[PDB]
Design an enzyme around this catalytic site. Structure first.
Site, PDB file in Angstrom:
ATOM      1  N   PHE A  79       8.563  80.453  30.093  1.00 31.93           N
ATOM      2  CA  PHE A  79       8.267  79.914  28.761  1.00 31.93           C
ATOM      3  C   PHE A  79       7.534  80.923  27.891  1.00 31.93           C
ATOM      4  O   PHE A  79       6.482  81.420  28.287  1.00 31.93           O
ATOM      5  CB  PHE A  79       7.392  78.652  28.881  1.00 31.93           C
ATOM      6  CG  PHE A  79       7.196  77.921  27.567  1.00 31.93           C
ATOM      7  CD1 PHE A  79       6.158  78.272  26.703  1.00 31.93           C
ATOM      8  CD2 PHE A  79       8.068  76.914  27.184  1.00 31.93           C
ATOM      9  CE1 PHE A  79       5.995  77.637  25.487  1.00 31.93           C
ATOM     10  CE2 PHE A  79       7.912  76.268  25.957  1.00 31.93           C
ATOM     11  CZ  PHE A  79       6.871  76.630  25.105  1.00 31.93           C
ATOM     12  N   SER A 154       6.183  80.855  35.366  1.00 26.41           N
ATOM     13  CA  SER A 154       6.961  79.701  34.919  1.00 26.41           C
ATOM     14  C   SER A 154       8.372  79.683  35.566  1.00 26.41           C
ATOM     15  O   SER A 154       8.521  79.725  36.796  1.00 26.41           O
ATOM     16  CB  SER A 154       7.022  79.820  33.384  1.00 26.41           C
ATOM     17  OG  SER A 154       7.621  78.722  32.735  1.00 26.41           O
ATOM     18  N   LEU A 155       9.399  79.511  34.743  1.00 22.46           N
ATOM     19  CA  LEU A 155      10.788  79.534  35.219  1.00 22.46           C
ATOM     20  C   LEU A 155      11.038  80.918  35.921  1.00 22.46           C
ATOM     21  O   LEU A 155      11.740  81.009  36.932  1.00 22.46           O
ATOM     22  CB  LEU A 155      11.707  79.305  34.018  1.00 22.46           C
ATOM     23  CG  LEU A 155      12.885  78.333  33.900  1.00 22.46           C
ATOM     24  CD1 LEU A 155      12.802  77.116  34.797  1.00 22.46           C
ATOM     25  CD2 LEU A 155      13.072  77.922  32.393  1.00 22.46           C
ATOM     26  N   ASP A 177       2.078  79.951  37.974  1.00 25.21           N
ATOM     27  CA  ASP A 177       2.372  78.569  37.552  1.00 25.21           C
ATOM     28  C   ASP A 177       3.865  78.241  37.500  1.00 25.21           C
ATOM     29  O   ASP A 177       4.422  77.998  36.427  1.00 25.21           O
ATOM     30  CB  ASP A 177       1.711  78.164  36.209  1.00 25.21           C
ATOM     31  CG  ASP A 177       1.428  76.662  36.144  1.00 25.21           C
ATOM     32  OD1 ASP A 177       0.941  76.135  37.153  1.00 25.21           O
ATOM     33  OD2 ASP A 177       1.791  75.972  35.165  1.00 25.21           O
ATOM     34  N   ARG A 191      14.423  77.134  44.960  1.00 25.55           N
ATOM     35  CA  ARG A 191      13.083  77.409  44.461  1.00 25.55           C
ATOM     36  C   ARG A 191      12.338  78.512  45.162  1.00 25.55           C
ATOM     37  O   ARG A 191      12.663  78.883  46.260  1.00 25.55           O
ATOM     38  CB  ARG A 191      12.276  76.133  44.657  1.00 25.55           C
ATOM     39  CG  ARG A 191      12.455  75.621  46.092  1.00 25.55           C
ATOM     40  CD  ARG A 191      11.598  74.414  46.452  1.00 25.55           C
ATOM     41  NE  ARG A 191      12.068  73.838  47.711  1.00 25.55           N
ATOM     42  CZ  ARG A 191      11.523  74.086  48.888  1.00 25.55           C
ATOM     43  NH1 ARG A 191      10.422  74.811  48.965  1.00 25.55           N
ATOM     44  NH2 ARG A 191      12.035  73.537  49.987  1.00 25.55           N
ATOM     45  N   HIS A 264      -0.326  76.221  31.022  1.00 23.18           N
ATOM     46  CA  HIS A 264       0.820  76.880  31.631  1.00 23.18           C
ATOM     47  C   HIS A 264       0.678  78.419  31.561  1.00 23.18           C
ATOM     48  O   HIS A 264       0.984  79.105  32.543  1.00 23.18           O
ATOM     49  CB  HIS A 264       2.092  76.401  30.932  1.00 23.18           C
ATOM     50  CG  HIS A 264       3.363  76.807  31.616  1.00 23.18           C
ATOM     51  ND1 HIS A 264       3.554  76.713  32.979  1.00 23.18           N
ATOM     52  CD2 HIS A 264       4.549  77.221  31.104  1.00 23.18           C
ATOM     53  CE1 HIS A 264       4.796  77.031  33.279  1.00 23.18           C
ATOM     54  NE2 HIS A 264       5.427  77.342  32.154  1.00 23.18           N
TER      55      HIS A 264
HETATM   56 CA   LIG Z   1      13.634  80.314  47.766  1.00 18.86          CA
END
Ligand SMILES: [Ca+2]
Ligand SMILES: *[C@@H]1O[C@H](CO)[C@@H](O)[C@H](O)[C@H]1NC(C)=O
Length: 441
Positions: A79, A154-155, A177, A191, A264
């Site tokens: 972000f 973030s992302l 974060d 993830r 964030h």
């Molecule tokens: Ca992974």
């Protein structure tokens, strides 16, 4: 359905990418050219202007200041808040003050500024391009991924996760974060998780539930070391978002909806500062932030406390610590026990430490009835490490026609990173708002 892109393979919308309860929408990653991923290299030789690196073209590495004998640190954003575009470069610049390194900023802003599900899925492609850059360095320059750290905010934390997943033996991934939505509850493949690199350290700063607090971060432990500064949900000095049972993720990511990104973004503000302050973020293992704040998890364990941020790799479950509310977020925690003397009075007893490297401000230790012969303790986070404690100063503010005098017959001090305790004493007492100095005993 499946989309395949040159050199980075294919991506399907099969489960767990979509068609699941956590990721319902079937959306495929945009193409490398729509995303427009750029690898901007900055080195101590070229700290201000970038050199463009292409993962499909080894020559860009030859036509750059890239050094095969140095560490490499990729900075991958998520972000971007207005006024925040130069943070990645601001972070490289702090690295140059303490080391010779290849700092590659990975800009994929066009791929992040769209609906959330689309931005979440675009991560897959950016991570594959970062892995592509890494396989190329390995292949054409015999530069091992063990010499690389991926810092993803973030992302970007999941972009790093993807890269790691595709690059066996990656030395380190730092998640600043990491976002929770569309990533929590998925197979490790989707993830950032510990299996993505030999060392994964994670800083949580906006982990309150998305609904209704609009927290973008995650509470879930995601690395080998997970840090929750100030508890991990609300950062001092940051305004919060207005609660709501209905959050417009798409609107916030495409930049049409208001969002208070302070919490964030703190994750990278603290990491950037940690680079310059190697001892400013000692972290303590604890059951919860409440147990930490209740003075139950201090001092540091025998082996030491890990530093949150850049030097966390120096260290060999949940970790807590506190930071300032504004720059030079760095803090050092101390524990003190005051045994009162003089006469009974009601008020606020305070203490300041004076050591070889400087002194702290006056810190609230105990408020209430100050009775002689009693002892009270507390822990506080000061703005510096005072070095060797040479003397301590006691002060009390009253809440009495006889003008009682309150003192401290003995104050014991414990630095978080030390095993011993230091004792200071006095036989004197002072009136309210007068500083009393205790000396070694
Ligand atoms: Ca992974
Ligand atoms: C880089 O290495 C690959 C795999 O060995 C090879 O096919 C490619 O030609 C090399 N690139 C250059 C510019 O030599």
């Amino acid at each position: 359905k499946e989309v395949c892109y040159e050199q980075i393979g294919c991506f399907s919308d099969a489960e767990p990418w979509a068609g699941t309860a956590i990721r319902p929408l079937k959306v495929l990653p945009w193409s490398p050219e729509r995303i427009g991923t750029r690898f901007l290299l900055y080195t101590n030789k070229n700290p201000n202007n970038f050199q463009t690196l292409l993962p499909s073209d080894p020559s860009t590495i030859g036509a750059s200041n890239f050094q095969t004998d140095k560490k490499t640190r990729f900075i991958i954003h998520g972000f971007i808040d207005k006024g925040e575009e130069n943070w990645l470069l601001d972070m490289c610049k702090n690295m140059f003050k303490v080391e010779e390194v290849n700092c590659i900023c990975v800009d994929w802003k066009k791929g992040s500024q769209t609906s959330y599900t689309q931005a979440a899925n675009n991560v897959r492609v950016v991570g594959a391009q970062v892995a592509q850059m890494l396989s190329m360095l390995s292949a054409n320059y015999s530069y091992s991924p063990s010499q690389v750290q991926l810092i993803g905010h973030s992302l970007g934390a999941h972009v790093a996760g993807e890269a790691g997943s595709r690059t066996p033996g990656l030395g380190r991934i730092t998640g600043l974060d990491p976002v929770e939505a569309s990533f929590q509850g998925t197979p490790e493949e989707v993830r950032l998780d510990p299996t993505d690199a030999d060392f994964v350290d994670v800083i949580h700063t906006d982990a309150a539930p998305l609904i209704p607090f609009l927290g973008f971060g995650t509470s879930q432990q995601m690395g080998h070391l997970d840090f929750f500064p100030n508890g991990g949900e609300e950062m001092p000095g940051c305004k919060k978002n207005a609660l709501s049972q209905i959050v417009d993720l798409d609107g916030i990511w495409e930049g049409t909806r208001d969002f208070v990104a302070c919490n964030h973004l703190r994750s990278y503000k603290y990491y950037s500062e940690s680079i310059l302050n190697p001892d400013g973020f000692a972290s303590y293992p604890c059951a919860s932030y409440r147990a930490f704040e209740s003075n139950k998890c201090f001092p540091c364990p025998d082996q030491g406390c890990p530093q949150m941020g850049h030097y966390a790799d120096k260290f060999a479950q949940k970790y807590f610590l506190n930071t300032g509310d504004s720059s030079n977020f760095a803090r050092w925690r101390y524990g003190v026990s005051i045994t009162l003397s003089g006469k009974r009075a009601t008020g606020q007893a305070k203490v300041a430490l004076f050591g070889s490297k400087g002194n702290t401000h006056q810190f609230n230790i105990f408020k209430g009835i100050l009775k002689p012969g009693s002892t009270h303790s507390n822990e506080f986070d000061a703005k510096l490490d005072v070095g060797t404690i040479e003397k301590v100063k006691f002060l009390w503010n009253n809440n009495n026609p006889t003008f009682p005098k309150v003192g401290a017959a003995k104050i014991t001090v414990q630095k978080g990173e030390e095993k011993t305790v230091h004792s200071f004493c006095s036989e004197s007492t002072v009136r309210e708002d007068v500083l009393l100095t205790l000396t070694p005993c």
